[PDB]
C-alpha cells in the first residue's frame, strides 16, 4: 500500500523536521516488509532515540507511519536540533553502591529531574548497563508537595561460576575466554546481554548461523546457568517460494513445483545430523542458481514441537520460466518469409531436460531446423549427460560460384560423464547428408562431362560440382565450466576442447580431422553491473576436410563488422572482448571489440580472393556497441560493429538480430 501522510505522535521535542529528513518513508512510498525492516534498522542505528515503537497505520487507503519514540539523554550536545530537550531528596541509600553519588551524578539530578521518573526508568536501565543492580522499584513518598522518591533496588551478586551446557561444537574454554562478565565480577544485566550477543556472533563466525540461547539465567548462588542450543536439521523440505504473485492465488497447481523432487534432492548439500553449516547452505544455493531454472532461493527455520534442538528447515524456491514460444515474421515483396520462431522448453517434462524446436529463415536463402534435446543428468544416475539434436540447414551463399546453395541434414548425439562439478568429458557423434550446388549461369560443362569456368577468356577445369555425399564423424570433447549462471554469467571460466575425426564421401573420399579450443572467462569490471568478458576461439583442421566443412569467420557469431564467411580456411583463431553493463533488469549495454581471421584455405572456388598464408597475419579487427535487452517475452540481442584498423571491406554499419 502507498502512504498518504506521515503523522508522527509523541515526538513532542525530538524534531519532526529532523526525523522526516532522516526517515525515508515519505508520502506515496511503497510498503514492504523488507522496506520497513531496513527503515527500522536505519532509525535504530541513527541514535536519535533509545526505544521506538513505529506502528504503521492504515489511512485513506494508504499507510500512516506513526512512530512512538523514547529518546535517550546523550545527543543534545549536537546543537543542530535535539531531542526531548522544588524537590529536595532522593532517599534510600543503597548497599553495594551509595546510590547518591552515582545517581546524583550520572542519572539523578541531571536525568532524574527530581521527578517524572521516565528518565529514572532509564536510570535503572543504565544501572543494568553497569549491571550492578537487578531490580529497581521507585516508590515515591510525596508528602506535602515534597517527595522522597524511595528507590528500592535489588543488587546483583557477583557471579561465582559460569556453566555452559549443550554447546557441543565450541569448546567451553573458548566460550569462557570470550565471556566478559567473568567470575569474581558483579553480575551485569546489559553486559550479560551483550555477552550473549557476542556469543551468538562467535557462533556465526565459526560457520553456525542457526544457534539460539534459550536460557541465560543466574540462580541465587551466583551460578550463571548459561544454556546454548545448537539446532540440528532433522528434516529438510522443499516448497516453492510464494511471493507477491499478483493475479494468482495459492491454488494447488500454483504452489506445486513442475520440477520433479529428485532434481532438487540430488542438489541439496545440507545433511541431517549436522549443525546447519551456513557454508553448506551457500553451496546448495549456488548449485541451485547454477541449475538455471531458478531465480531466487531462501531458507526458513521452523521448530518441531517436543524437540528443542530439532529444526524443520524449509527451502523456498522461485521458478522463472519453463515454456517459451517466440516468433517474428516479415514478408511481402523485397525479401521473403523472414521468420524466426522458437519452441524452447528448458524444463520439458519437469526433468530439467532442455527440449526445443528452432526454425529460422532469412533473405539470403537461409533455412534452419533444430530439434535439440539435452539431459544434463539422467534420473538417478552418477552424473551422466545425454541428448541428441537433429538439424537441417539449407544454407545459401550467393558469393561463391561453386557453392551457391548448400543443403545439410544432420542427426548428432552427445553423451558425457562429469568428473566432478566442473570437469565434463563427453563423446559426441553425428551423421550429415550434404548437397552442394554451383551458381547457375556461371559454370559451363562441356560435352565431355567435365566442368569449366571462364576467367579472362579461357576455360579452367573445376571439379566437385554438384556434390552429394554422406558425412560421418565422432568427437570426444572435454569441457571445463565454472560459471555461476548459464543464462547471464557474471564470473567464471568456460573452456571447451574437441578433437574431431570422421569419414566423408563424395569428391576425394577419405577421412578428415578437426580440433577446436574455445575459452570463455569473466571477471568484475569498472563498477556495479560492469562485467568484463573475454572469449577466444581456436581451431585447426587438416586440408582433407571438405570445402563446405572448412572454418568460416564472420557474421554476428564470430567476427562482427564483416559479412558471413568473410574469411575461410582450415586454421581459425578469433578473440573477442566485451564489456556488458546491466543498467536494469530488462536492458543491457555492451561494448565489444573482436579480432580474428581464417588461414590456409587452398580451395577450388575462386570466389575466395582473400586466401592468405602466414598464420597470425592480417588479423582483421572490429569494434562496436551492442544492445542486449531482456524483453518480457524473451531475451533479444542487437549488435552494431565498426570495422576498424585494417579496413579491407568498405562497409560501415552492421546489424545483427539474435537471442
Amino acid at each position: 500500500l502507498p502512504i498518504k501522510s506521515v503523522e508522527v505522535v509523541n515526538n513532542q521535542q525530538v524534531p519532526a523536521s529532523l526525523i522526516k529528513n532522516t526517515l525515508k518513508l515519505k508520502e506515496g512510498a511503497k510498503f514492504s516488509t523488507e522496506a520497513l525492516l531496513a527503515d527500522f534498522n536505519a532509525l535504530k542505528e541513527t541514535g536519535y532515540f533509545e526505544d521506538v515503537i513505529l506502528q504503521p497505520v492504515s489511512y485513506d487507503g494508504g499507510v500512516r507511519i506513526v512512530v512512538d519514540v523514547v529518546e535517550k539523554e546523550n545527543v543534545v550536545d549536537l546543537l543542530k536540533e535535539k531531542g526531548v530537550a522544588v524537590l529536595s531528596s532522593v532517599k534510600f541509600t543503597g548497599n553495594k553502591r551509595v546510590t547518591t553519588s552515582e545517581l546524583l551524578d550520572i542519572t539523578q539530578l541531571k536525568a532524574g529531574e527530581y521527578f517524572s521518573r521516565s528518565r529514572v526508568e532509564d536510570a535503572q536501565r543504565r544501572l543494568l548497563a553497569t549491571g550492578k543492580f537487578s531490580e529497581v522499584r521507585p516508590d515515591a513518598q510525596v508528602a506535602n508537595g515534597k517527595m522522597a522518591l524511595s528507590f528500592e533496588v535489588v543488587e546483583n551478586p557477583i557471579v561465582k561460576s559460569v556453566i555452559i551446557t549443550g554447546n557441543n561444537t565450541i569448546p567451553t574454554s573458548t566460550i569462557m575466554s570470550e565471556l566478559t562478565t567473568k567470575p569474581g565480577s558483579v553480575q551485569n544485566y546489559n553486559n550479560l546481554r551483550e555477552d550473549r550477543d557476542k556469543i551468538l556472533g562467535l557462533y556465526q563466525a565459526q560457520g553456525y548461523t542457526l544457534v539460539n540461547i534459550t536460557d541465560m539465567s543466574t540462580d541465587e548462588n551466583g551460578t550463571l546457568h548459561i544454556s546454548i542450543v545448537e539446532g540440528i536439521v532433522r528434516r529438510i523440505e522443499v516448497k516453492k517460494m510464494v511471493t507477491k504473485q499478483k493475479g494468482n492465488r495459492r491454488t494447488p497447481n500454483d504452489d506445486v513445483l513442475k520440477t520433479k523432487d529428485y532434481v532438487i534432492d540430488r542438489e541439496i548439500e545440507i545433511q541431517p545430523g549436522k549443525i546447519f553449516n551456513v557454508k553448506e547452505y551457500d553451496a546448495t544455493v549456488d548449485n541451485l542458481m547454477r541449475l538455471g531454472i531458478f531465480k531466487n532461493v531462501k531458507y526458513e527455520a521452523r521448530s518441531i514441537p517436543g524437540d528443542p534442538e530439532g529444526i524443520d528447515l524449509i527451502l523456498l524456491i522461485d521458478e522463472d520460466r519453463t515454456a517459451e514460444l517466440q516468433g517474428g515474421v516479415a514478408y511481402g515483396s523485397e525479401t521473403g518469409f523472414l521468420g524466426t520462431l522458437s519452441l524452447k522448453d528448458s524444463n520439458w517434462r519437469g526433468k530439467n531436460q532442455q527440449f526445443g524446436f528452432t526454425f529460422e529463415k532469412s533473405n539470403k536463402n537461409y533455412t534452419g531446423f533444430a530439434l535439440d534435446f539435452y539431459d544434463p543428468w539422467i534420473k538417478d544416475t552418477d552424473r551422466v549427460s545425454w541428448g541428441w539434436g537433429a538439424y537441417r540447414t539449407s544454407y545459401g551463399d550467393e558469393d561463391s560460384i561453386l557453392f551457391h546453395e548448400i543443403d545439410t541434414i544432420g542427426f548428432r548425439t552427445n553423451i558425457g560423464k562429469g568428473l566432478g562439478k566442473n570437469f565434463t568429458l563427453s563423446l559426441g557423434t553425428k551423421v550429415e547428408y550434404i548437397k552442394e550446388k554451383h551458381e547457375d549461369g556461371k559454370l559451363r560443362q562441356a560435352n565431355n562431362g567435365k566442368w569449366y569456368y571462364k576467367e579472362k577468356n579461357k576455360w579452367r577445369e573445376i571439379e566437385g560440382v554438384d556434390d552429394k555425399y554422406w558425412l560421418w564423424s565422432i568427437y570426444p570433447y572435454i569441457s571445463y565450466d565454472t560459471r555461476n549462471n548459464y543464462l547471464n554469467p557474471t564470473s567464471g571460466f568456460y573452456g571447451k576442447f574437441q578433437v574431431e575425426a570422421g569419414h566423408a564421401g563424395g569428391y576425394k573420399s577419405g577421412n578428415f580431422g578437426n580440433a577446436t579450443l574455445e575459452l570463455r572467462t569473466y571477471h568484475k569490471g569498472l563498477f556495479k553491473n560492469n562485467i568484463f568478458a573475454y572469449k577466444v576461439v581456436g581451431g585447426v583442421a587438416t586440408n582433407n576436410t571438405k570445402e563446405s566443412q572448412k572454418f568460416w569467420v564472420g557474421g554476428g557469431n564470430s567476427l562482427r563488422g564483416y559479412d558471413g564467411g568473410f574469411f575461410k580456411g582450415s586454421q581459425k583463431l578469433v578473440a573477442t572482448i566485451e564489456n556488458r553493463t546491466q543498467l536494469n533488469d530488462i536492458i543491457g549495454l555492451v561494448v565489444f571489440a573482436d579480432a580474428g581471421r581464417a588461414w590456409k584455405q587452398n580451395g577450388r572456388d575462386p570466389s575466395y580472393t582473400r586466401d592468405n598464408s602466414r598464420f597470425g597475419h592480417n588479423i582483421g579487427t572490429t569494434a562496436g556497441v551492442g544492445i542486449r535487452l531482456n524483453t518480457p517475452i524473451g531475451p533479444l540481442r542487437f549488435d552494431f560493429g565498426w570495422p576498424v584498423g585494417n579496413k579491407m571491406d568498405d562497409d560501415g554499419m552492421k546489424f545483427y538480430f539474435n537471442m
Partner: antibody
Amino acid sequence: EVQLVESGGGLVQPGGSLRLSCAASGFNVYSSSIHWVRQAPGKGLEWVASIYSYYGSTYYADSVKGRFTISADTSKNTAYLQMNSLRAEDTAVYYCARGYSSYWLKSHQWPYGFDYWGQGTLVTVSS
Amino acid sequence: QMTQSPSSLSASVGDRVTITCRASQSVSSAVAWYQQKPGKAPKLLIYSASSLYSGVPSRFSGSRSGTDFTLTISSLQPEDFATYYCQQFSQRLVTFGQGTKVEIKR
C-alpha cells in the same frame, strides 16, 4: 511436559492489592514470552500484559497502563504480576499463556498465538 | 480493531459451520482462534492460516477474506461444541473477539 500453573490469587476488597505468579515447567522464560489474559465471568477473554524477555519490552494493553506491573525473573523461571487499586471489572480468572512463533530461531519473538495455557486463578474484588 | 464476530450460532453434528471475524489492520495482520472448552481453558488451533501441529483432527481450517477471517470446520463432532474466539496481532496490541458459541440444533 510443558505446563504452567498460576498462584498468588486470592480475595480482595476494592482498592486492594495482590501479586499473581505463573511458574514455567520445562521452558525458560528468558526466551519465551509469557502473556497474561483474563476472562470475566460469562464474558470473553481480554489481554492484560506481556513481558518479552530477550528483548526487555514490558508494556500493558489498555486498562493496566499504570495500575499493575508484570515482572518476570528467570532465576525461579516464573513471571510475577502485581495487583493494586483493583476495581469492579477486575473480578475474573487469570490465565498465563506462552506465545510461540513458528520460527525456531528465538530472536523472532512475535507471539503468533498462545498455545500453552495455565490452569487459571480466581480473583474476586467484591467487598 | 474491535474484531466483532457473530455471537450466537447454531449447527448440528456433521454440519459445516463458518465464523467471520472482522478486522482493520495492515498486511502483516495474523489471526489465531481457540476452541475454548466451556469448562477449563482455550486451546489454539490455527496460526495465521494454518493449524497447530499437535492438536487438530484435520477439521478446523480457515483463511483470510480481505479484512474478514473465517473458519471451515468439517463435519461436527460431539466434543467440538464449545466457545470459539478470534484474535488479531498488531504492533503490540492483542485484541480478542467477542466470541461465538456452538451447539446442537433441534
